[PDB]
């Protein structure tokens, strides 16, 4: 769960980026 | 997961909002 | 991880529902 | 994990989308 992880630190990265609109 | 969670709970209640206008 | 699965569903179906407009 | 994983690409996509709105 190293890739699940790291998969869910793009989708943060990303939700915050659309948040920022 | 938590910090993921609160950051999609953010994104949830906006669009809810943006769905208002 | 069910919940949060289906809260990126919700969240994925809103998106959807925005991008429709 | 898979379906999670599954769900977290779909939703990735439709923040993409929308970031090229």
Same mark, same amino acid.
């Given at each position: 769960?190293? %890739? @699940?992880?790291? #998969?869910? #630190? #793009? !989708? %943060?990265?990303? @939700?915050?980026? !659309?948040? %920022?609109?």
């Amino acid at each position: 769960v190293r %890739k @699940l992880r790291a #998969e869910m #630190e #793009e !989708l %943060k990265s990303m @939700l915050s980026q !659309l948040g %920022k609109t």
